[PDB]
Enzyme design. Structure first.
Site, short mmCIF file in Angstrom:
data_model
loop_
_atom_site.label_atom_id
_atom_site.label_comp_id
_atom_site.label_asym_id
_atom_site.label_seq_id
_atom_site.Cartn_x
_atom_site.Cartn_y
_atom_site.Cartn_z
N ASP A 1 -3.83 10.07 -14.66
CA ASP A 1 -3.25 9.41 -14.47
C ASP A 1 -3.29 9.06 -16.12
O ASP A 1 -2.00 9.37 -16.99
CB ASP A 1 -2.28 8.84 -14.26
CG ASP A 1 -2.34 8.96 -12.37
OD1 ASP A 1 -1.33 9.63 -12.31
OD2 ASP A 1 -2.01 8.76 -12.12
N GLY A 2 -4.59 8.51 -16.57
CA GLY A 2 -4.38 7.92 -17.76
C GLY A 2 -4.19 9.65 -19.19
O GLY A 2 -4.27 9.29 -19.98
N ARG B 1 11.11 -17.55 -19.79
CA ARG B 1 9.83 -18.00 -19.78
C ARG B 1 8.70 -18.04 -18.93
O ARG B 1 8.92 -17.67 -17.81
CB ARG B 1 9.59 -19.85 -20.65
CG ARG B 1 10.82 -20.18 -20.84
CD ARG B 1 11.40 -21.23 -21.16
NE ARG B 1 12.52 -21.89 -21.81
CZ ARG B 1 12.31 -22.43 -22.83
NH1 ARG B 1 11.74 -22.12 -23.21
NH2 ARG B 1 14.27 -22.89 -23.37
N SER C 1 9.56 7.44 -12.55
CA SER C 1 8.00 7.53 -11.75
C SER C 1 7.17 6.47 -12.00
O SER C 1 5.61 6.53 -11.48
CB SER C 1 7.51 9.09 -12.34
OG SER C 1 7.71 8.81 -13.46
N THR D 1 5.61 3.22 -9.14
CA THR D 1 4.45 2.38 -8.87
C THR D 1 3.05 2.55 -9.31
O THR D 1 2.78 2.79 -8.57
CB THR D 1 4.31 4.23 -8.37
OG1 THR D 1 4.67 5.19 -9.07
CG2 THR D 1 5.45 4.55 -6.80
N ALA D 2 3.52 1.68 -10.43
CA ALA D 2 2.48 1.86 -11.46
C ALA D 2 2.78 0.24 -11.94
O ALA D 2 2.55 -0.33 -10.46
CB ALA D 2 2.41 2.86 -13.12
C1 LIG Z 1 -4.48 4.19 -18.53
N1 LIG Z 1 -3.41 3.69 -17.28
C2 LIG Z 1 -2.78 5.40 -16.79
C3 LIG Z 1 -2.28 5.26 -15.52
C4 LIG Z 1 -1.80 4.82 -14.51
C5 LIG Z 1 -1.01 5.42 -13.40
N2 LIG Z 1 -0.15 5.97 -13.59
C6 LIG Z 1 0.58 6.11 -12.27
C7 LIG Z 1 1.87 5.62 -11.39
N3 LIG Z 1 3.04 6.39 -12.25
N4 LIG Z 1 2.19 5.85 -10.33
C8 LIG Z 1 1.20 5.38 -9.47
N5 LIG Z 1 -0.45 5.19 -10.11
C9 LIG Z 1 -0.62 4.77 -11.49
N6 LIG Z 1 -1.68 5.40 -12.35
C10 LIG Z 1 -2.43 4.37 -11.85
O1 LIG Z 1 -2.92 3.46 -11.66
C11 LIG Z 1 -3.81 2.74 -11.31
C12 LIG Z 1 -4.85 1.84 -13.01
O2 LIG Z 1 -4.20 2.09 -13.90
C13 LIG Z 1 -5.01 4.31 -11.88
O3 LIG Z 1 -3.99 4.03 -10.25
C14 LIG Z 1 -3.69 5.04 -12.23
O4 LIG Z 1 -4.15 6.39 -11.54
C15 LIG Z 1 -1.60 3.37 -17.98
C16 LIG Z 1 -0.97 2.52 -16.57
O5 LIG Z 1 -1.75 1.54 -16.80
C17 LIG Z 1 -0.70 1.02 -15.52
N7 LIG Z 1 -1.13 -0.43 -15.71
C18 LIG Z 1 -1.48 -1.24 -16.72
N8 LIG Z 1 -2.27 -2.77 -15.39
C19 LIG Z 1 -1.89 -2.58 -14.57
C20 LIG Z 1 -2.33 -3.16 -13.16
N9 LIG Z 1 -2.04 -5.12 -14.46
N10 LIG Z 1 -1.25 -3.21 -12.70
C21 LIG Z 1 -1.06 -1.91 -12.21
N11 LIG Z 1 -0.94 -1.05 -12.79
C22 LIG Z 1 -1.56 -1.54 -14.36
C23 LIG Z 1 0.40 1.09 -16.23
O6 LIG Z 1 0.53 1.58 -15.54
C24 LIG Z 1 -0.10 1.65 -17.37
O7 LIG Z 1 0.65 2.39 -17.53
#
Ligand SMILES: CN(CC#Cc1nc2c(N)ncnc2n1[C@@H]1O[C@H](CO)[C@@H](O)[C@H]1O)C[C@H]1O[C@@H](n2cnc3c(N)ncnc32)[C@H](O)[C@@H]1O
Ligand SMILES: CN(CC#Cc1nc2c(N)ncnc2n1[C@@H]1O[C@H](CO)[C@@H](O)[C@H]1O)C[C@H]1O[C@@H](n2cnc3c(N)ncnc32)[C@H](O)[C@@H]1O
Ligand SMILES: CN(CC#Cc1nc2c(N)ncnc2n1[C@@H]1O[C@H](CO)[C@@H](O)[C@H]1O)C[C@H]1O[C@@H](n2cnc3c(N)ncnc32)[C@H](O)[C@@H]1O
Ligand SMILES: CN(CC#Cc1nc2c(N)ncnc2n1[C@@H]1O[C@H](CO)[C@@H](O)[C@H]1O)C[C@H]1O[C@@H](n2cnc3c(N)ncnc32)[C@H](O)[C@@H]1O
Lengths: 259, 259, 259, 259
Positions: free
Chosen positions: C45-46, C143, C153, C156-157
């Site tokens: 996804d990154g 705060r 979309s 789920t992230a």
């Molecule tokens: C670098 N990342 C790429 C991405 C993505 C991603 N997008 C989705 C999606 N749309 N739906 C479902 N899973 C997703 N993943 C999945 O995120 C999981 C770890 O990043 C992997 O399992 C990806 O496969 C950036 C993303 O880190 C997330 N993030 C930043 N801290 C986060 C946190 N504490 N908790 C949760 N998310 C976080 C944040 O969303 C940021 O955009």
């Protein structure tokens, strides 16, 4: 007896401190900020937190008292209008002492820290991934924003905002809470807050990045080349000078429900 | 020594129970379900909960052992294939005993109950409104679905699904969690789980309706004309016969993380 | 047609990319990473997030396709073994296009950003305090650690880990979630996630400190002398090339329940 | 025009209703509780909910108005002191109409229900276990206390106490939230609230027990021999008569933040 007074630094606190010092001059009370037996904090919880860390190497010889001129004042149990009554009761002495448990944090590369509220860990920029080891047993691999280990009296602070439970300070324990953990088909954490008793050791061990931002109450320090972060209930305790009944649950009620 | 074996009642458990009885016949072990010193539960956590309440008036004279033929088996620390090794170790005896705290529930109109997991309160149909009194101090007025007071070992059960923290059973305490509380400009609760030490008394007092559905572990009873529901850490403890190391946090890891 | 392929950069993805390019050479497909009509992302996804921002100024002329060689792959709906079948179907064309809403972020001191997952705000060191203004109406003073505004979309992230709801991408909306908000007698936030429709404008306005760490998907930038952060559903949409049925809720089920 | 007024039944509401009827007598307004074009509710949200279900078969011909003499009054946007101004503006007419989406619930054994707040499902005594099917696709097996499907305007009600998000009513959608779900090594649910658009169908199907307690807003009915519970955004909408600007987010702010 030997005492000192710290102040938030604003006009109301600086002035209130001078009046208490003047009132203490009418008794057998010596001002001494090197070896005080009683530390009075005039301000908010941040001011009280500063006073605690200012004297965290003489905790067994110091009783703390909080006067709140600030906004919330959880560790404070005195209003500014009651300051003169506090001076008299303090002079007569023979009050009751109450002890709250503290958290010990060890960072090996070794430095140790003492917390009254909590100690938290975050990454230095990249993603935060640590293995959580409990009593030498690997419990989980945490991926998220970070983790927070709280004292009992700290459970109403950062721990509360993270969904943690509120614990009575007579319970010698520490509580670990999660910050925005990733949980999917691949990544899995317990989710729930964890409450550990005395002599249990929680160890955080790096997976890739070894640089973490570690906070202990107010101060936050960047640590490099970290091999292990170790949490355990400290053997040291903070001592409060209590001059009346102010139960913890009433203190909680007044701070969150209504006052 | 005197023992008895309870069974989930299915084919695998009924058969396993007979083989253990046959194996115990080769030692100086007398089957006695009236005054057993060792109670063996073969089934799930529900079966173990039934065995506990079946003998909750001889808890100081009974050590419990759980064998899981069911699905999860949190109170069970033996697999069915290890049953013969358990028979031998049990016969030789001289094992280690481990005690978990229990919850006392008092319902005044007076009936008392003992819980190993938790005790919950809901309304008998209408809205649920109770005043929460802690050590004679009014803490909050709760409006919602109900409340749940959990033992330490019960924190991984209903308490966990309600957002409560997981506590180690060496901590003699009880944890109160909320069920869907109403919180707006007018109605206000603490929201957070509350962990109470020994000798703290939590009292629920009705506001309008006096009929509540009160559950203690598995059983759920409708109580009428209720004046007060009282929670406190019981003076009684459940005793387990432990033949090896199975730490609580590993038990937690195996049940929620991976096994 | 004009296409390009981005790669996670590892051995499996770099090799898979070369084989697809070789397969596309057998059709009327021209490789062009300046004006591609189809962008193929091979990785996680990154990697897909990088491909989106690499071409975020031609979103109306580009259809995206994700192949996951990584770990989770939420935006990917193709396994590496299906790459040759994807090449053929892509060559024949006449697929179906599916559009997901995007988030617009405006930072005035003016710079605008486009997000596929979310945009978050935190402090530059000190405490994070902002006034939340909805459609010119002051809604709350927040705060805490920060705030997160998610696309459908993106729910789920990061949004999911913060307790937010999962929204179907056919709903043109954005969701605001809280990061560890302070709530006591003095400080008060809504607590709940907020889902805003199109043309609603959420504005964050500083109270004291004006320096914030603002993230848009992967990239995180320190912004200074900030006067306002503005959130709204973008008029731009991302377009996917869908060659079969992979419903959003099945995509959710496979990523969080079981696959 | 044709109107009717329902009352909470207490002294303040019964008296206020008579004064409005007397005021309407000075205009061309006919009282008719069989085919009213305008339904005025004087009381709380429960009274307004009763008025809605009293006329849920003429929703396309009725505009609703809420006057709150009760405690909170979320669907009410008029104070009792403004009643005379409401009578005049209502007589002149030519107001603006605002429509909120509604929830359709179908129970097959077939009976259909219409909800303004939400529809929930619980067990009839034993454990609650249902398979959650989304658009004919099996999404999860839910084990817990129950499930709650909320309208947009209902998200500030039971949905909010269950951790659900607050949705703007211009979004034609429904939100499913969990009640104390079991999640361990064996049992697994999504945990997060789910927001479904129009024409998506969520179906609950029994696993063992077929008796459920199904609530639709206020009323709660025991259903026996249930084969399926079906949720979807209704084609019917409730219509409000709005005489001034009272935005949804300000209504939210006044009800939860401060007023
Ligand atoms: C670098 N990342 C790429 C991405 C993505 C991603 N997008 C989705 C999606 N749309 N739906 C479902 N899973 C997703 N993943 C999945 O995120 C999981 C770890 O990043 C992997 O399992 C990806 O496969 C950036 C993303 O880190 C997330 N993030 C930043 N801290 C986060 C946190 N504490 N908790 C949760 N998310 C976080 C944040 O969303 C940021 O955009
Ligand atoms: C500088 N602060 C001094 C303090 C304190 C304090 N201690 C308590 C307490 N024991 N019980 C009840 N309230 C307390 N406050 C009260 O915290 C509120 C704001 O800080 C004020 O209302 C204090 O009155 C450091 C503290 O910031 C906290 N913090 C850091 N981010 C936090 C976050 N996102 N959410 C919640 N807490 C956070 C964290 O605990 C840190 O130690
Ligand atoms: C009949 N039950 C026997 C038990 C037990 C049990 N005890 C534990 C435990 N101590 N730790 C970890 N898992 C445990 N289980 C495991 O609970 C799961 C399902 O019951 C099974 O996986 C057991 O294996 C009664 C219990 O149902 C619970 N319950 C009632 N509604 C609940 C709910 N909505 N959510 C969560 N729990 C609930 C409640 O605790 C009640 O006492
Ligand atoms: C009889 N009730 C009338 C109503 C309503 C109402 N609707 C809204 C709304 N749309 N937005 C904001 N507040 C609202 N209230 C406000 O609900 C509060 C208490 O009911 C009062 O403050 C009302 O003013 C039925 C309602 O009870 C609710 N309920 C049932 N258990 C609930 C629970 N454990 N937690 C939360 N809600 C619950 C459930 O929604 C059910 O429909």
């Amino acid at each position: 007896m030997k005492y000192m007074i710290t102040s938030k630094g604003d006009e109301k606190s600086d002035l209130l401190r001078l009046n208490m010092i003047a009132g203490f001059g009418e008794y057998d009370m010596e001002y001494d900020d090197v070896e005080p037996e009683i530390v009075i904090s005039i301000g908010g919880d941040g001011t009280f937190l500063s006073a605690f860390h200012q004297y965290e190497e003489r905790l067994d010889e110091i009783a703390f008292i909080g006067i709140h001129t600030g906004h919330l004042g959880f560790y404070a149990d005195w209003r500014p209008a009651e300051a003169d009554k506090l001076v008299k009761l303090l002079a007569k002495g023979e009050y009751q002492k109450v002890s709250y448990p503290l958290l010990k944090t060890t960072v090996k590369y070794e430095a140790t820290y003492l917390a009254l509220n909590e100690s938290t860990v975050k990454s230095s920029g990249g993603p935060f991934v640590v293995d959580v080891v409990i009593n030498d047993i690997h419990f989980e691999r945490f991926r998220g924003d970070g983790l927070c280990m709280s004292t009992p009296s700290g459970t109403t602070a950062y721990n509360k905002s993270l969904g943690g439970a509120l614990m009575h300070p007579s319970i010698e324990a520490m509580q670990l809470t999660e910050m925005a953990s990733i949980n999917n088909r691949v990544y899995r954490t317990i989710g729930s807050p964890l409450v550990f008793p005395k002599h249990h050791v929680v160890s955080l061990q790096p997976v890739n990045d070894k640089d973490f931002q570690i906070s202990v109450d107010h101060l936050s320090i960047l640590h490099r080349d970290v091999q292990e972060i170790r949490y355990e209930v400290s053997a040291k305790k903070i001592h409060f000078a209590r001059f009346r009944s102010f139960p913890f649950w009433r203190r909680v009620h007044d701070s969150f429900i209504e006052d």
